[PDB]
Design a protein around this nucleic acid. Sequence first.
RNA 1: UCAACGCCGGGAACCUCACCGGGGGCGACGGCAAGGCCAGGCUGAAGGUCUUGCCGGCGAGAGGAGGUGCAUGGCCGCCGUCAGCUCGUACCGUGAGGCGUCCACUUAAGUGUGGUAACGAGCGAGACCCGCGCCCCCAGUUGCCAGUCCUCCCCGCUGGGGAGGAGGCACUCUGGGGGGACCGCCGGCGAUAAGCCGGAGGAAGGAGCGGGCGACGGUAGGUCAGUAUGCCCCGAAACCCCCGGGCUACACGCGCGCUACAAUGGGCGGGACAAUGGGAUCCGACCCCGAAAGGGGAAGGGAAUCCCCUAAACCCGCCCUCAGUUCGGAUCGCGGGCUGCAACUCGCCCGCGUGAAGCUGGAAUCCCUAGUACCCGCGUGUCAUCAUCGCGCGGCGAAUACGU
Lengths: 54, 64, 195, 100
Amino acid sequence: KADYNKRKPRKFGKGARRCMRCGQYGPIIRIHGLMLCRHCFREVAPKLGFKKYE
Amino acid sequence: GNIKQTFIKRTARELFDRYPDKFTRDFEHNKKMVAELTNVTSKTIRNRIAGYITRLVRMKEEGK
Amino acid sequence: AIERYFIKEGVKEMLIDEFLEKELRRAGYGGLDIKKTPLGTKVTIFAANPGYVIGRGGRRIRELTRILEKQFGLENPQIEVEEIKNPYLNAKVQAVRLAQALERGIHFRRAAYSAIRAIMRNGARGVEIRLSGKLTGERAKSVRFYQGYLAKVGNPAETLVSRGYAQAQLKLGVIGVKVSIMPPDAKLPDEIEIK
Amino acid sequence: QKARIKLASTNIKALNEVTDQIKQIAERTGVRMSGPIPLPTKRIRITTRKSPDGEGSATFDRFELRVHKRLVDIEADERAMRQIMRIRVPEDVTIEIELI
RNA sequence: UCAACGCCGGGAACCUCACCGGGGGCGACGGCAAGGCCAGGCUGAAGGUCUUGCCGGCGAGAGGAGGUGCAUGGCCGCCGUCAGCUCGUACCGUGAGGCGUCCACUUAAGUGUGGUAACGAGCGAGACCCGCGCCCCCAGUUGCCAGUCCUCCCCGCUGGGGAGGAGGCACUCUGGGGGGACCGCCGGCGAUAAGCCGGAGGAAGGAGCGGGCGACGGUAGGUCAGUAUGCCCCGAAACCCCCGGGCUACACGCGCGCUACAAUGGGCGGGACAAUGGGAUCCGACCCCGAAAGGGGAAGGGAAUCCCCUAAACCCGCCCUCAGUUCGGAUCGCGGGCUGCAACUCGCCCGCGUGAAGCUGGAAUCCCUAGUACCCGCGUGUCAUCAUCGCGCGGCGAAUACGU
Ligand SMILES: [Zn+2]
């Protein structure tokens, strides 16, 4: 009964990754080891140390 | 526009109404004087002030 | 490599900061600082009332350093608990205070003016407070209080002013509180003084 | 024998601090030094979209993280190594040392 | 409608998933054993279910990609990077409200100079931050190699030309600090002011060029399907897993683009010259198999050290010589392979054959002022594979106007 309740493991695809902060599936930044979605990065970026500079 | 701002003009008028014996009708001399008398971390502002003072003195020698 | 390490540090400390932000609300949570060393990892917590963090009869200081092990895996760490003096200039603590007041039941104008004068009496060239939500009936609205000087846009907006945001959850819904403060030692590029 | 120190950081002041410290400790003693040597700066850029929805024109947000690097060789004399490892380095700087 | 339609970073094989068909599990706490396994049958498969045995000692809530964006927060888009919005005191008015914030000249600018029932402040502008271009100082490896010395190699007409290595930083380059340009000098106009216009000087001139930050507020504008969140609703299902289908279905109407309808060119063979960025079961030089796609070994590299990387348009020589063709290259057949647990539905790549519309386009309509547009290709984002897309990079390089 405990088996038919929790996932098959995924080593690739789209259900392999998940946001650290919120838990989203699709849009995820992977650049240089980051694992945040496009939404949480825009909020936590000035804490990580990023600037506009443009 | 090549406009001077009010606080620039105010600073220059003050520095020319007191400490007048220092400035002359040349630019670099007054650049040195301004950087000697002010607390500044820019150069465009200093040059603007120096040129305004140059104008002021070069037509104060004439009056009006 | 290099970027990977920097970014992982950032992410880990940020997640910890958020966990503490939410699970140390009453005490007042102003910041955090993690220091790496061979003797173990030190973690300093800023706050106003360290007693709440301490948990006289324990049950808090061990909760803390054992959850840090269980979940976020810090290297056999331990924690220091500092205190903020003159916390009336940090905006996050003030925003959370105002939200706690609103949840208690104080009128928003009363509480806002109270906070503004308390931030004036202790040293501040400018302060701006903003509330948003169902303040008066269903139809939401936004209200704004201000005193002094401000630097909304430019570089000084970023580098001089202290900003904070918080949420208040009431019988009906959510109210957003924004606070911005200009400390006394702030000088602008236009404020010159003749020798 | 020589020793090579690599320094990386997001802050130039910490780098200048460490450089001045080791330069002075090596000068007050008799040791021929090398550097400081600047390597190119590493910039991590990320361009994302502002809106959390689809509607609206596309306005993009460009964030940047600059990282400055320095290199030194110190010649690893008798006491130089043991007196340099006794430095008070801030925790926003990454310092490594390699013996050649 | 502008401000939906290569947009939701939305390039969906499973997952993503919210849709369709079937199967199976979930009840904190509080009040009157639960659960587990061999062999086989039901079953798409299955201690899910039973056959045979043995082991173990009624109410609330979790959760919800379920409704409400016309209940909220926060974030974004548009008026608008527009020049506008307010305060204190005084005065005019029964009052709503006005003045200041108006007029003349000026500026990108409620930017400034003069006059005035107004005198003075603030928030936006400007200031500020980043980068490109010229000069100087420090510095000199993982970057560079002119002059110096040793070697080694080849060529005519004996003078020229290349590779190591020591050893140097001169030139290039990297990244820290500092200077320099300010209508400053020179003749008008205006007012004798504010500034504008010649001309001089000057790596560069008239906020030097390109960007970022974007106000008090409105738009019941978009988002509850990014997280957070109130009311209703499902609570044994609308919760949580798996296994198969669909979002790829096609008489048609539209948006944005790619490829072309030839010679300002198609093909074959030979000559050339970049930059931005990225790399751990990742980039893979070098060698060997295979006609090609691709396969087996494997140095080096944790990023000024090695790789991805001798880019395309361009130049030269031969064939075609205004033709539905040596243009065009869709659509179909037989074959060979990679990534993946699984390629029919529904994936990318190769080789040989087949060879469809299209011969410059009505009414209308869009983008662009200088290293800019047109034209050429290249990393990266997504990524186990898959780029006619998004964000950036360089190479070749104009025409016209300095207005209304
Ligand atoms: Zn997230």
